[PDB]
């Protein structure tokens, strides 16, 4: 992962957010490859104040160096991360609960009919299955009304409380009694971030089983990302050495090396050459040949990299 | 992004740009 100078603030912001949410355990900072400090929340980021202090320590360390970066200088961030230790804030947990509460009245199973299975009373009429009211999410689950946790350890939504129903699953007209409907205890879990999001396709869902009974899910999680859960990665902020090619200094990229790097517009370069020559020998001024701070200069926009 | 070549002397700027034009043209 490498980024140019103009976008350093949003790169550092990403690293600060990872320190705050416990996904980043340590950052090693280096200027031009020379180690310049390490940023590590004390006590494995147990307290919010220590994680915020780490994010501030990182910004103070780098913001001036990145703001005046040039000359080909660069800044490296060697970042050890763990996506699974992610914690979420009170506001983030509140937003997930708000969405989760919209599933409270949704229907899991419709009333049965003569030709489509569904909700059937446990008491029969004529020894025959009669339909019952639809089975709603709230009939099987009690979604929590509040979030739990702390600023230090993060916030979470408790697992929705499981319930039972005596209503059954069958068809109207059937002398055979309806089948049982039961929560799936392996498909109901709490949400605390931890690199997961709520899987809304699989959550709050009835699944007809091979033996004719029905299982229901509560909250089911999935990964928020495809990227690997753990690792150590190095984010680099670069500056362009060819931004200011000073022909009189001890370090400048040569014309040949510049031409290996970039393809140039032949008209743009030919016209710059002619203006330099005409100014040097004939005294003709040109806007292509700046004289500023004791140095003659010209400006080029490459057509692109050479590939 | 822009590239800025500069020199105290017009002759050194000319030599650099001349070289740049030559190498740009060999491709």
Numbering used by the authors:
A (entry chain A): 7 to 313
B (entry chain C): 11 to 37
Sentences from the paper on this structure:
The surfaces of most bacteria and archaea are covered with a proteinaceous coat, the surface or S-layer, which is formed through the self-assembly of individual protein subunits into a regularly spaced, two-dimensional array. In C. difficile, the S-layer largely consists of a major S-layer protein, SlpA, which assembles into a paracrystalline array enveloping the cell. The major protein of the C. difficile S-layer, SlpA, is post-translationally cleaved into two S-layer proteins (SLPs): the high molecular weight (HMW) and low molecular weight (LMW), herein referred to as SLPH and SLPL, respectively. These subunits then form a complex (referred to as H/L) that is incorporated in the S-layer.
Conformational flexibility in the organisation of SlpA is further demonstrated by different arrangements observed in the structure of a truncated derivative of SlpA (SLPL/HID) and the H/L complex. Our models indicate the presence of a hinge, formed by the D1-LID linker. Analysis of the architecture and simulated motions (DynDom6D v1.0) in these models identified regions of D1-D2 and LID/HID as two dynamic domains, with the residues making up the linker between the D1 C-terminal β-strand (β17L) and the LID N-terminal β-strand (β18L) acting as an interdomain hinge. The calculated rotation angle of the centres of mass of the D1-D2 region relative to LID/HID of 166° suggests a high degree of flexibility of these regions, at least in the absence of the CWB2-containing SLPH core, with minimal effects on the fold of each individual domain. The fact that we observed this conformational flexibility in our protein crystal models, with no apparent effect on the fold of individual regions, suggests how the effector domains of other CWPs inserted in the functional S-layer can be accommodated by flexible rearrangement of D2. The strikingly different arrangements of the D1-D2 domains in SLPL, relative to the interacting domains observed in the H/L and SLPL/HID structures, are consistent with this proposed flexibility.
